[PDB]
């Protein structure tokens, strides 16, 4: 029955990604004095399905200069890793309960970056190469600060087990304890998911399509699905880490509802930011993270190391 559980996690997540596309289109339109898609289906509900069918019934083109093996492998890696990262999340009970789930998610996010770089390099197009290099710069900018913030926050948890975050935040949200780290973490999640104002890899205005400029039909659909799934998964991680939820062991549905609502709110915030702010220059993104976020993260990491000791609040290891 574990296979049933894996399918239950996978299939609904992909449908959630599909309808997230509709939600984004409508939210941005309404924030722009427009109505998002409404013609296709009641209130635009069937637009995602039409988009998926159109993309998968569209000719996929293999670039003449492309390296076919990497060109094909990259979307597979992106989608599979995007689906994999959802596994360890406690909602409330995780599909795979790992002692070090947080480090697993960090490593898997690191692995997903190669999908963008491999896609851009294999495309053998100048714009794709520029997008891949931008992705490299983005990872260089954000990875260290992301890891340090996660370590600082998890010091109060006492472990890297995602499930134990629920117990730690039983009485209060961790955002109250670590609201600055929460802000830097939210921006870093925006950077990791390559979302505005850090949508540099794709950068339609500056790079025609970035790394996916040479991708069409199914592979592009896979890249889009990976992107949106990563958005949802990272926002869910933020909800678990900071905006904890009440869990009644006899009724998990309450925790599941609270968690889903918080993640929806965070994803809506993502779309809101994409609508509101302009895009950063990748030099500016790297400067922001290294010159502004990194020193504050180091100072706050020192603070969070000291605070449990000086306040006798060291969390239980188990």
């Amino acid at each position: 029955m574990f296979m049933i559980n894996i399918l239950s996690l996978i299939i609904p997540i992909l449908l959630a990604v599909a309808f997230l596309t509709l939600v984004e289109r409508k939210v941005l339109g309404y924030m722009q004095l427009r109505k998002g898609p409404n013609v296709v289906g009641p209130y635009g509900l069937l637009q995602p399905i039409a988009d998926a069918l159109k993309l998968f019934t569209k000719e996929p083109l293999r670039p003449a200069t492309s390296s076919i093996s990497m060109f094909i492998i990259a979307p597979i890696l992106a989608l599979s890793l995007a689906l994999t990262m959802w596994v360890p999340l406690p909602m409330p009970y995780p599909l795979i309960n790992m002692n070090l789930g947080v480090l697993f998610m960090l490593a898997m996010s690191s692995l997903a970056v190669y999908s963008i770089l491999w896609s851009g390099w294999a495309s053998n197009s100048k714009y794709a190469l520029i997008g891949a290099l931008r992705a490299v710069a983005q990872t260089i900018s954000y990875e260290v600060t992301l890891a340090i913030i996660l370590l600082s926050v998890l010091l109060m948890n006492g472990s890297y087990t995602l499930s134990t975050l629920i117990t730690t935040q039983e009485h209060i949200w961790m955002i109250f304890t670590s609201w600055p780290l929460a802000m830097m973490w939210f921006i870093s999640t925006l950077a990791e998911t390559n979302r505005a104002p850090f949508d540099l890899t794709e950068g339609e205005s500056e790079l025609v399509s970035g790394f996916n400029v040479e991708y069409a039909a199914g592979p592009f659909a896979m890249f889009f699905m990976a992107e949106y799934a990563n958005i949802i998964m990272m926002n869910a991680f933020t909800a678990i880490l900071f905006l904890g939820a009440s869990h009644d062991p006899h009724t998990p549905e309450l925790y599941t509802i609270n968690f889903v609502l918080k993640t929806l709110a965070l994803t809506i915030t993502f779309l809101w930011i994409r609508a509101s702010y302009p895009r950063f220059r990748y030099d500016q993104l790297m400067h922001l993270l290294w010159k502004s976020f990194l020193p504050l993260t180091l100072a706050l990491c020192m603070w969070h190391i000291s605070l449990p000791i000086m306040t006798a609040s060291i969390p239980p290891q188990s």
Binding site: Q32, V40, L61
Partner: protein, 156 residues
């Protein structure tokens, strides 16, 4: 025949997917592009109909030739059309694109984009009003709705 019914229904599904999700490429040559942007503007928002502007030719389904096509720009237009994956549809907007319009007798103007690329729907006007362009796009959607690829496959 049951096979004919299955083919007809699958063709209906494919045509509905293709017409509902029509992604024009970000290609605007001349003044007609401005009316295209006004079509993208809130009043006649084309996103409601599923028409979303996508820059990359490989991620686009429709090319709208808005503006005069000079002899200098024609090879680039043909290249962009060729690099666009199929099914691909071309809409010619404005008199300049349709047949050369005001600059028909110029040395530097292609007297119609039909000479360079096949055109499916011609939207008259100079500039065509945004409502006219939306009407043309919906006409292209109906044309897609009338397509019978799978039925012809079964009958062939």
């Amino acid at each position: 025949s049951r096979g004919e019914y299955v083919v007809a229904k699958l063709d209906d599904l494919v045509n509905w997917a293709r017409r509902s999700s029509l992604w024009p490429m970000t290609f605007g040559l001349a003044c007609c592009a401005v009316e295209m942007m006004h079509m993208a503007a809130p009043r006649y928002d084309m996103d409601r109909f599923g028409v979303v502007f996508r820059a990359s030719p490989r991620q686009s389904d429709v090319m709208i030739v808005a503006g005069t096509l000079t002899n200098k720009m024609a090879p680039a237009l043909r290249k962009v059309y060729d690099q666009m994956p199929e099914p691909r549809y071309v809409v010619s907007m404005g008199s300049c694109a349709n047949g050369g319009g005001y600059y028909h007798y110029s040395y530097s103007v292609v007297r119609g984009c039909d000479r360079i690329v096949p055109v499916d729907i011609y939207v008259p006007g100079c500039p065509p009003t945004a409502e006219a362009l939306l009407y043309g796009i919906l006409q292209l959607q109906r044309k897609i709705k009338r397509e019978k690829r799978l039925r012809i496959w079964y009958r062939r």
